[PDB]
Amino acid sequence: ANLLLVPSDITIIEEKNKIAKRRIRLLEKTGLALMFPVFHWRYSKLDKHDMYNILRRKFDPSASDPAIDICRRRQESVRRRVIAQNGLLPGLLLGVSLPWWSLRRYNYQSKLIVLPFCAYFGAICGRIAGHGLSWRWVETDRQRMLGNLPAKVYYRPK
């Protein structure tokens, strides 16, 4: 048999209610660039491309339509996710450079033992800082769910 991929219902609403293009802020551009690629063995998660489309559309701030309100809430959730990605790179670089300078005079074995762990720990610290500064720790479960709704869904006949 065959599988059909179509835009999700929430994607349809966003297209219908968009009024213009939305400028992509500097941190949003860097965040999208630094986001890892997401191979799709199956479709269940938003990738960097889907997030770009969400951030590109512009909605009316004053619109009281419940559907438009959901679109704005989804966009804000995605924005916080994207800008949070900027924290990964600084942590990784500091996680490697700082220990490496500290152990510069020591033998090669020490650098092999210590740097890999410090690199991962630095990245972890960067990701925590990025997500914390992006207001992700205060999002309600509702906002988080909207930001994670898939953009593409397998079509279900009938």
């Binding site: 890892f36 690629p37 997401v38 191979f39 799709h40 063995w41 199956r42 479709y43 269940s44 998660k45 762990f117 991962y120």
Partner: protein
Amino acid sequence: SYKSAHQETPLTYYRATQHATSSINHRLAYINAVFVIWVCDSLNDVDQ
């Protein structure tokens, strides 16, 4: 005029023992745990 030589690392030739190998596994338990967490973290980000 005379100098003494220094042998290579014994790891390449010294005979192994069952207890010696197990001790290494005991010391590497945490290293493996970190490795697995990293693999799962990567998969959660790059797969599906």
